[PDB]
Design a binder for this molecule. Structure first.
Ligand SMILES: *CCC(=O)Nc1ccc(-n2nc(C)c(-c3c(C)ccc4n[nH]cc34)c2C)cc1
Ligand SMILES: Nc1nc2c(ncn2[C@@H]2O[C@H](COP(=O)(O)OP(=O)(O)O)[C@@H](O)[C@H]2O)c(=O)[nH]1
Ligand SMILES: [Mg+2]
Ligand SMILES: [Mg+2]
Length: 168
Protein backbone atom coordinates (compact mmCIF):
# COMPACT_ATOMS: atom_id res chain seq x y z
CA UNK A 1 0.00 0.00 0.00
CA UNK A 2 1.50 3.35 -1.11
CA UNK A 3 1.59 6.05 1.58
CA UNK A 4 1.16 9.73 0.49
CA UNK A 5 1.82 12.90 2.50
CA UNK A 6 -0.74 15.60 1.63
CA UNK A 7 -0.53 19.19 2.88
CA UNK A 8 -3.59 21.53 2.98
CA UNK A 9 -2.53 25.19 2.55
CA UNK A 10 -4.39 28.48 2.18
CA UNK A 11 -5.22 31.76 3.85
CA UNK A 12 -6.77 32.00 7.37
CA UNK A 13 -10.48 31.21 7.33
CA UNK A 14 -10.74 29.51 3.88
CA UNK A 15 -11.87 26.14 5.31
CA UNK A 16 -8.61 24.18 5.58
CA UNK A 17 -9.72 22.42 8.79
CA UNK A 18 -13.36 22.10 7.71
CA UNK A 19 -12.39 20.28 4.50
CA UNK A 20 -9.95 18.00 6.36
CA UNK A 21 -12.46 17.12 9.10
CA UNK A 22 -15.17 16.42 6.48
CA UNK A 23 -12.84 14.00 4.68
CA UNK A 24 -11.73 12.20 7.89
CA UNK A 25 -14.73 12.29 10.30
CA UNK A 26 -17.61 13.11 7.89
CA UNK A 27 -18.89 16.18 9.74
CA UNK A 28 -18.81 19.95 9.23
CA UNK A 29 -17.15 22.00 12.00
CA UNK A 30 -18.30 25.61 12.25
CA UNK A 31 -15.89 26.91 14.91
CA UNK A 32 -12.58 25.02 14.48
CA UNK A 33 -9.80 26.56 16.62
CA UNK A 34 -7.65 28.48 14.08
CA UNK A 35 -4.37 27.64 15.85
CA UNK A 36 -4.64 23.84 15.78
CA UNK A 37 -2.21 22.30 13.29
CA UNK A 38 -2.73 18.52 13.05
CA UNK A 39 -1.96 15.44 10.92
CA UNK A 40 -4.69 12.85 10.06
CA UNK A 41 -4.42 9.37 8.56
CA UNK A 42 -7.01 7.73 6.29
CA UNK A 43 -6.97 4.67 4.01
CA UNK A 44 -8.88 5.26 0.73
CA UNK A 45 -9.46 3.53 -2.63
CA UNK A 46 -8.80 5.73 -5.64
CA UNK A 47 -9.14 4.31 -9.14
CA UNK A 48 -9.08 0.76 -7.76
CA UNK A 49 -5.84 1.25 -5.80
CA UNK A 50 -5.61 1.72 -2.03
CA UNK A 51 -3.39 4.41 -0.54
CA UNK A 52 -2.78 5.56 3.02
CA UNK A 53 -3.17 9.34 3.17
CA UNK A 54 -1.33 11.35 5.79
CA UNK A 55 -2.87 14.84 5.63
CA UNK A 56 -1.34 17.92 7.34
CA UNK A 57 -3.91 20.62 7.97
CA UNK A 58 -1.71 23.77 8.33
CA UNK A 59 -2.29 26.59 10.82
CA UNK A 60 -0.09 29.17 12.78
CA UNK A 61 1.22 32.63 11.87
CA UNK A 62 1.83 34.29 8.50
CA UNK A 63 5.60 34.13 8.96
CA UNK A 64 8.71 32.55 7.54
CA UNK A 65 9.69 29.49 9.51
CA UNK A 66 12.70 27.33 8.66
CA UNK A 67 10.76 24.54 10.54
CA UNK A 68 7.69 25.02 8.27
CA UNK A 69 10.03 24.60 5.22
CA UNK A 70 10.92 21.17 6.78
CA UNK A 71 7.25 19.96 6.90
CA UNK A 72 6.66 21.42 3.45
CA UNK A 73 9.67 19.66 1.93
CA UNK A 74 8.29 16.26 3.09
CA UNK A 75 4.85 16.99 1.56
CA UNK A 76 4.28 15.07 -1.69
CA UNK A 77 1.16 16.98 -2.82
CA UNK A 78 -0.59 20.19 -1.83
CA UNK A 79 -4.14 21.51 -1.83
CA UNK A 80 -4.05 25.23 -2.58
CA UNK A 81 -7.25 26.35 -0.93
CA UNK A 82 -9.05 29.68 -1.48
CA UNK A 83 -12.61 30.71 -0.56
CA UNK A 84 -14.88 31.97 -3.45
CA UNK A 85 -16.11 35.02 -1.42
CA UNK A 86 -12.57 36.24 -0.48
CA UNK A 87 -10.51 37.61 -3.43
CA UNK A 88 -7.52 38.15 -1.15
CA UNK A 89 -7.33 34.36 -0.47
CA UNK A 90 -7.34 33.72 -4.29
CA UNK A 91 -4.61 36.42 -4.82
CA UNK A 92 -2.70 34.68 -1.97
CA UNK A 93 -2.53 31.34 -3.96
CA UNK A 94 0.42 32.64 -6.07
CA UNK A 95 2.47 33.35 -2.93
CA UNK A 96 1.63 29.89 -1.52
CA UNK A 97 2.73 28.18 -4.80
CA UNK A 98 5.97 30.23 -4.90
CA UNK A 99 6.76 29.10 -1.31
CA UNK A 100 6.08 25.41 -2.07
CA UNK A 101 8.20 25.69 -5.23
CA UNK A 102 11.04 27.42 -3.32
CA UNK A 103 11.24 24.73 -0.63
CA UNK A 104 11.06 21.83 -3.11
CA UNK A 105 13.55 23.50 -5.66
CA UNK A 106 11.21 22.46 -8.50
CA UNK A 107 8.40 23.81 -10.69
CA UNK A 108 6.35 20.52 -10.84
CA UNK A 109 5.09 19.64 -7.40
CA UNK A 110 1.64 17.85 -7.40
CA UNK A 111 -0.95 20.52 -6.52
CA UNK A 112 -4.72 21.03 -6.81
CA UNK A 113 -6.38 24.46 -6.76
CA UNK A 114 -9.45 24.26 -4.46
CA UNK A 115 -12.33 26.76 -4.55
CA UNK A 116 -13.99 26.29 -1.19
CA UNK A 117 -17.31 27.66 0.16
CA UNK A 118 -19.07 26.95 -3.19
CA UNK A 119 -22.38 26.67 -1.27
CA UNK A 120 -22.35 30.45 -0.58
CA UNK A 121 -24.44 32.56 -2.95
CA UNK A 122 -22.04 35.51 -2.36
CA UNK A 123 -19.18 35.18 -4.84
CA UNK A 124 -16.23 37.49 -5.55
CA UNK A 125 -13.88 35.06 -7.38
CA UNK A 126 -15.23 34.04 -10.80
CA UNK A 127 -14.91 30.34 -11.81
CA UNK A 128 -13.27 31.43 -15.11
CA UNK A 129 -10.49 33.24 -13.10
CA UNK A 130 -9.81 30.08 -11.09
CA UNK A 131 -10.04 27.79 -14.17
CA UNK A 132 -7.54 30.06 -16.01
CA UNK A 133 -5.17 30.20 -13.00
CA UNK A 134 -5.16 26.38 -12.64
CA UNK A 135 -4.73 26.20 -16.46
CA UNK A 136 -1.55 28.39 -16.45
CA UNK A 137 -0.22 26.43 -13.42
CA UNK A 138 -0.83 23.07 -15.19
CA UNK A 139 -2.92 21.73 -12.28
CA UNK A 140 -6.58 20.63 -11.74
CA UNK A 141 -9.08 23.00 -10.10
CA UNK A 142 -11.81 21.47 -7.79
CA UNK A 143 -14.87 23.44 -6.50
CA UNK A 144 -15.79 22.34 -2.97
CA UNK A 145 -18.01 23.05 0.03
CA UNK A 146 -16.86 21.70 3.38
CA UNK A 147 -20.41 22.61 4.59
CA UNK A 148 -22.38 20.41 2.17
CA UNK A 149 -19.49 17.91 1.50
CA UNK A 150 -19.61 18.88 -2.28
CA UNK A 151 -16.32 18.03 -4.06
CA UNK A 152 -14.55 17.17 -0.75
CA UNK A 153 -13.49 13.56 -1.59
CA UNK A 154 -12.92 14.82 -5.19
CA UNK A 155 -10.35 17.47 -4.18
CA UNK A 156 -8.26 14.93 -2.14
CA UNK A 157 -8.64 11.95 -4.63
CA UNK A 158 -7.64 14.32 -7.48
CA UNK A 159 -4.52 15.38 -5.52
CA UNK A 160 -3.67 11.65 -5.11
CA UNK A 161 -4.08 11.13 -8.91
CA UNK A 162 -1.63 14.04 -9.41
CA UNK A 163 0.95 12.46 -7.05
CA UNK A 164 0.59 9.08 -8.77
CA UNK A 165 1.12 10.72 -12.18
CA UNK A 166 4.23 12.63 -10.91
CA UNK A 167 5.87 9.51 -9.36
CA UNK A 168 5.82 7.44 -12.57
C1 LIG B 1 -5.64 31.31 10.30
C2 LIG B 1 -4.61 30.18 10.50
C3 LIG B 1 -3.87 29.92 9.25
O1 LIG B 1 -4.53 29.50 8.30
N1 LIG B 1 -2.55 30.25 9.22
C4 LIG B 1 -1.62 30.13 8.15
C5 LIG B 1 -0.29 29.95 8.51
C6 LIG B 1 0.72 29.87 7.56
C7 LIG B 1 0.42 29.93 6.21
N2 LIG B 1 1.48 29.91 5.36
N3 LIG B 1 2.08 31.02 4.90
C8 LIG B 1 3.11 30.73 4.22
C9 LIG B 1 4.01 31.70 3.53
C10 LIG B 1 3.24 29.27 4.31
C11 LIG B 1 4.36 28.45 3.71
C12 LIG B 1 4.19 27.60 2.60
C13 LIG B 1 2.81 27.43 1.94
C14 LIG B 1 5.28 26.86 2.09
C15 LIG B 1 6.56 26.98 2.63
C16 LIG B 1 6.71 27.81 3.74
N4 LIG B 1 7.84 28.08 4.44
N5 LIG B 1 7.51 28.97 5.42
C17 LIG B 1 6.28 29.31 5.38
C18 LIG B 1 5.64 28.55 4.24
C19 LIG B 1 2.21 28.86 5.05
C20 LIG B 1 1.93 27.44 5.45
C21 LIG B 1 -0.90 30.25 5.82
C22 LIG B 1 -1.92 30.32 6.79
N1 LIG C 1 -20.46 28.27 4.29
C1 LIG C 1 -19.29 27.68 4.38
N2 LIG C 1 -18.50 27.91 5.36
C2 LIG C 1 -17.25 27.21 5.48
C3 LIG C 1 -16.93 26.29 4.57
N3 LIG C 1 -15.65 25.84 5.04
C4 LIG C 1 -15.39 26.44 6.12
N4 LIG C 1 -16.35 27.28 6.42
C5 LIG C 1 -16.40 28.21 7.54
O1 LIG C 1 -15.39 29.24 7.46
C6 LIG C 1 -14.68 29.43 8.69
C7 LIG C 1 -13.20 29.03 8.52
O2 LIG C 1 -13.09 27.62 8.40
P1 LIG C 1 -11.76 26.84 8.87
O3 LIG C 1 -11.83 25.41 8.50
O4 LIG C 1 -11.66 27.18 10.42
O5 LIG C 1 -10.67 27.75 8.11
P2 LIG C 1 -9.08 27.46 8.20
O6 LIG C 1 -8.57 28.67 9.07
O7 LIG C 1 -8.65 27.79 6.72
O8 LIG C 1 -8.67 26.16 8.82
C8 LIG C 1 -15.43 28.57 9.74
O9 LIG C 1 -16.33 29.40 10.49
C9 LIG C 1 -16.18 27.52 8.89
O10 LIG C 1 -17.44 27.19 9.45
C10 LIG C 1 -17.82 26.05 3.44
O11 LIG C 1 -17.49 25.24 2.58
N5 LIG C 1 -18.96 26.79 3.41
MG1 LIG D 1 -7.60 25.57 10.54
MG1 LIG E 1 0.81 19.53 -14.31
Amino acid sequence: MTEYKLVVVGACGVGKSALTIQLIQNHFVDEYDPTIEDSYRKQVVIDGETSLLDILDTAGQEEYSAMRDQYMRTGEGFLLVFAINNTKSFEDIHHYREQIKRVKDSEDVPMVLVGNKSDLPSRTVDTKQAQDLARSYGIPFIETSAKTRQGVDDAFYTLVREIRKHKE
